């Protein structure tokens, strides 16, 4: 199929600065290009249609231009309620080909992280696995890593983490990895600790507790 | 108004068959164009197919490869997808579209997909997965104080070994609001999903206040509600 | 060019204004062009925009009602009310007349066109016998007749066999 | 009558026009405004409010928002135009193509 | 060996026309038939110098406004200019009946 | 005939609108036409001087001032001013777009009637690639190429030596 | 607005047999009636009448 590029992969600009999101086709196609509002959980919205002109119902903050392959997504109006996903369609020739999509996240001054853990309890020890969970929050960028280790022993292909989107007020991110152990193995080791490491963090913060006292 | 609604959801085993529905109203069904755009968990749209008015032009993607079967229905006003040999890879949230026509502002004679897609619908949830549908379990997390700088604590539930996704969770049957935050689900590498839940309190109110955390899985209506302490 | 030297339209082809109709011993079936029709609805689409978007309407009346002992002022709105429509009654019917007569010399100008998209690479691989008709003097398979439909037909490379019949 | 510019009254004030030949009559009892000057005219325009500056420049169509010679048919500046001047219409571009299309 | 091709004038311009066949058309030669452009000046008409009143609106002047004692009226003229914030007017209020038609007529 | 059956203007030929491209042994350049282009700019000029000559506009004024007693000659004032104005928002928008439509066609015309007067000289003696070219088959000297501008070039004089190659 | 049976003057000033009428705190137009006789219930000469009817 005739494939897609976007560049870059997420923009974190604040409110009233520019934001430049461009969508480069495989082959020239210099008439027909789409542009698309996607939100989670929400119907998405054309915004830009053939590259040159806009939708009815789309405010004049957006603005799209370029002939061949080479085309630029100018916001010079940007509103706290654009913060979204973006994502460009080739409309010529088939298949409709879609874009890979760029998260828009607002830029703000960076701030530590608030490390968490939890230790495992009594019900999850004896049904046979057992998982420490570890909490992170109050923390800016996205770009957030989970160190697992074990009696000063780094572990990994065991741990999982999930984040969440931003938050409306704050415009934070909350963070939490959960490493699973298996019965025996929990009982061989005693010291289990969360070591993170942050942009924020001048020093890697990282908190544990005894197996003995969970 | 112009709008379409979408159906068909609920969760079907590999090597069976599904059929979507989408409705129209509002608008002329037998002179625009309609298509059918799905979204993976964790990818972005992808068209499958295309139909004209009079069903003559079908078009399919790469990722079909005749697999699937659209109709419509000019009289009835309803479009139709028979989907077969689904596997795992087909877990996405199908929407239905239809086409723009023209260059200009109203469109009085619709055209062809020259100039995008503008009607969109709201979409249902379809999974094909080999797993069976499994209750979750419920383990509570035990509380401490480690913020020493801040001065407060954290508690939480831990939700695990469940399908399908997704699990709301709340804390006193909606009633505590402060400090509530919902984790996404992650599918793990077993086949079932994960998430989690915390609650933000102080360090002062630790070791004396409890809370109930609230576990409701809605398409398997399994309510668990376990005591944190 | 319809009731012409093109005798008329067909019912086969409902998907779109042109196209052609591919007749080959692979197969037979109506196809309409995906290029030159979207062009020219786009040409049509923006006719009716071009009365509709520049007739800047405001919030305002045509029709007013007056006194009978302001019969003076009465005869001008008269000449306001029917003076406006007796202008309309000469300048929107003269649209509908001209612009169809416009519309319809498009239409053929839309089959002058795709002629001279045909005839210039098919001047010798090609019989003109009327009606819209282009029958080749060799073998022309699905590809080749959609070779015609896009404008990528080489005219050297197809005067090899038709040379020949 | 209500307070304008500290002033409780009103004057009316009218007019009329005289022929070469008529004779003007005034009677009045009271309350008569008597003219000091008379103003002599002949004619075959209306008014303007503006604040641009008078110069000895010469056109041939007057505009509020400034001067125009024009030689056009048509103008999109001002409605309310005074002389031998082209029409107003609400759009911004009316630009007569001459030359072929611009395609190198 | 011989080439003959039928050339066609183009240039740097980015002056645009509105046709039917597409919108916004870059063209190479056009005759800007809308006038956009303004002087910024009251000129005459045919030879003849307007008359201006300044701060004063026609009110003031046919009337005899001592607020409007600087001013040089000549013997004719094409177009009376009044100001934006012309309130040196009627400095005694009243019911100016046939005022329109007046403004006209001068 | 732009963005079609030929690709676009050149930016050599600056002394007109149409012209030709020499291309021989004695040498190159761009010329423009002194027949063709003088009488197509005539058709143009007169086109500008058709909507400014015929507008016999007096020497009166467009707006006027009211009361607001009046208000029922007002509204009829406002069916007065932008009455008219809704009119030359119609009329006025309606001619240039069609104008530049007659433009556009009649410079499409202007290439039609340039090569009816290429084609009907050089029916055997050019060959057509498109984008507006004419190779010939023999020798074309300058003296040959001002031939085929003026519309003096003879078929039988030229086709001796054009049959051979 | 819709004022039903009474034309303009009978809303305007007030006429008693309008009586069942909300007024809505805006409108874009008024609507008549053919039959809109129980207007002015007393008679009399509205001057300036008809551009009363396009103000409101």
């Known amino acids: 199929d005739i494939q897609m590029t976007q560049s870059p992969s997420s923009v974190s600009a604040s409110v009233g600065d520019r934001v430049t999101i461009t969508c480069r086709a495989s082959q020239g196609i210099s008439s027909y290009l789409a542009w698309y509002q996607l939100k989670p959980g929400r119907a998405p919205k054309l915004l830009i249609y053939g590259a040159t002109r806009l939708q009815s119902g789309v405010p004049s903050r957006f603005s799209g231009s370029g002939s061949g392959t080479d085309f630029t997504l100018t916001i010079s109006g940007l509103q706290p309620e654009d913060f979204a996903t973006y994502h460009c369609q080739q409309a010529d020739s088939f298949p409709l080909t879609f874009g890979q999509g760029t998260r828009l996240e607002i830029k703000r001054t960076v701030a530590a992280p608030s490390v968490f853990i939890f230790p495992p309890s009594d019900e999850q020890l004896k049904s046979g696995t057992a998982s420490v969970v570890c909490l992170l929050n109050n923390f800016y960028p996205r770009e957030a890593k989970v160190q697992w280790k074990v009696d000063n022993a780094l572990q990994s292909g065991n741990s999982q983490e999930s984040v969440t989107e931003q938050d409306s007020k704050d415009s934070t991110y909350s963070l939490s990895s959960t490493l699973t152990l298996s019965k025996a193995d929990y009982e061989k080791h005693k010291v289990y600790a969360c070591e993170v490491t942050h942009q924020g963090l001048s020093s890697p913060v990282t908190k544990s507790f005894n197996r003995g006292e969970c | 108004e112009v709008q379409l609604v979408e159906s068909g959801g609920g969760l079907v085993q590999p090597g069976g068959s599904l059929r979507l529905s989408c409705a129209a109203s509002?608008?002329?069904?037998?002179?625009?164009?309609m298509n059918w755009v799905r979204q993976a968990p964790g990818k972005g749209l992808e068209w499958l197919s295309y139909?004209?008015?009079?069903?003559?032009?079908?078009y399919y993607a790469d990722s079909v490869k005749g697999r699937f079967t659209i109709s419509r229905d000019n009289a009835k006003n309803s479009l139709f997808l028979q989907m077969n040999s689904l596997r795992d890879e087909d877990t996405a949230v199908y929407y239905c579209a239809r086409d723009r026509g023209c260059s200009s502002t109203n469109c009085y004679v619709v055209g062809y997909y020259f100039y995008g897609m503008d009607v969109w619908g709201q979409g249902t949830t379809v999974t094909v997965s080999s797993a069976s549908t499994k209750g979750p379990s419920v383990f509570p997390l035990a509380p401490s104080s480690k913020s020493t700088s801040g001065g407060t604590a954290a508690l939480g539930c831990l939700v695990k070994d469940y399908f399908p996704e997704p699990v709301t969770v709340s804390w006193n049957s909606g009633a505590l609001t402060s400090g509530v935050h919902t984790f996404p689900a992650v599918l793990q590498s077993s086949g079932l999903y994960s998430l989690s839940s915390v609650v933000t309190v102080p360090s002062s109110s630790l070791g004396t206040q409890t809370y109930i955390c609230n576990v409701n899985h809605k398409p398997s209506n399994t309510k668990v509600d376990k005591k944190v302490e | 060019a319809i009731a012409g030297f093109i005798e008329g339209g067909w019912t086969g082809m409902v998907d779109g204004w042109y196209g052609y109709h591919h007749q080959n011993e692979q197969g037979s079936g109506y196809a309409a062009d995906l290029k030159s029709t979207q062009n020219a609805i786009d040409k049509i689409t923006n006719k009716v925009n071009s009365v509709i978007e520049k007739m800047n309407t405001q919030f305002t009346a045509v029709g007013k009602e007056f006194n009978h002992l302001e019969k003076r002022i009465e005869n001008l709105n008269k000449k306001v009310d029917d003076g406006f429509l007796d202008i309309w009654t000469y300048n929107a019917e003269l649209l509908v007349l001209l612009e169809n007569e416009r519309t319809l010399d498009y239409h053929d100008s839309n089959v002058k066109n795709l002629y001279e998209k045909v005839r210039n690479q098919l001047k010798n691989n090609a019989k003109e016998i009327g009606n819209g008709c282009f029958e080749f003097y060799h073998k022309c398979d699905n590809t080749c007749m959609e070779s015609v439909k896009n404008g990528t037909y080489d005219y050297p490379k197809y005067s090899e066999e038709a040379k020949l019949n | 009558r209500p307070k304008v510019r500290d002033q409780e009254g009103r004057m009316n004030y009218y007019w009329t026009l005289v022929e070469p030949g008529d004779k003007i009559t005034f009677e009045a009892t009271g309350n008569l405004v008597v003219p000091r000057y008379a103003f002599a005219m002949e004619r075959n325009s209306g008014i303007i409010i503006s604040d641009t500056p008078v110069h000895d420049c010469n056109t041939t169509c007057q505009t509020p928002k400034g001067a125009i010679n024009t030689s056009l048919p048509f103008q999109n500046i001002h409605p309310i135009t005074i002389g031998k001047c082209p029409k107003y219409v609400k759009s911004t571009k009316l630009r007569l193509a001459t030359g072929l299309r611009n395609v190198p | 060996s011989d080439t003959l091709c039928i050339g066609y004038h183009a240039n740097n311009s980015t002056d645009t026309v509105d046709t039917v066949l597409e919108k916004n058309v870059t063209v190479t030669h056009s005759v800007n038939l809308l006038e956009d452009k303004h002087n910024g000046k009251l000129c005459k008409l045919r030879g003849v110098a307007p008359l201006h009143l300044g701060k004063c609106n026609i009110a003031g002047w046919i009337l005899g406004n001592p607020e409007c004692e600087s001013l040089s009226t000549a013997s004719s003229w094409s177009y009376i200019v009044e100001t934006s914030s012309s309130d040196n007017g009627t400095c005694y209020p009243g019911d100016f009946i046939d005022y329109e038609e007046l403004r006209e007529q001068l | 005939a732009i963005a079609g059956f030929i690709e676009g203007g050149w930016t050599g030929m600056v002394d007109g609108w149409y012209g030709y491209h020499h291309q021989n042994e004695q040498g190159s350049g761009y010329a423009a036409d002194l027949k063709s282009t003088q009488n197509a700019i005539d058709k143009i000029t007169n086109k500008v001087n058709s909507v400014i000559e015929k507008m016999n506009t007096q020497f009166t004024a467009v707006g006027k001032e009211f009361n607001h007693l009046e208000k029922r000659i007002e509204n009829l004032n406002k069916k007065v001013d932008d009455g008219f104005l809704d009119i030359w928002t119609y009329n006025a928008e309606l001619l240039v777009l069609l104008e530049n439509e007659r433009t556009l066609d009649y410079h499409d015309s202007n290439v039609k009637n340039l090569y009816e007067k290429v084609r009907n000289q050089l029916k055997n003696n050019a060959k057509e690639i498109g984008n507006g070219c004419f190779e010939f088959y023999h020798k074309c000297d300058n003296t040959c190429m001002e031939s085929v501008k003026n519309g003096t070039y003879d078929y039988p004089k030229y086709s001796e030596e054009a049959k051979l190659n | 607005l819709h004022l039903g049976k009474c034309n303009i003057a009978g809303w305007i000033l007030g006429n008693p047999e309008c009586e069942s009428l909300s007024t809505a705190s805006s409108w874009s137009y008024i609507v008549e009636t053919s039959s809109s006789d129980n207007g002015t219930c007393y008679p009399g000469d509205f001057i300036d009448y008809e551009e009363l009817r396009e103000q409101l």
């Open positions: 509002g608008f002329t069904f037998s002179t625009y164009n």
């Open positions: 139909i004209s008015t009079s069903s003559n032009t079908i």
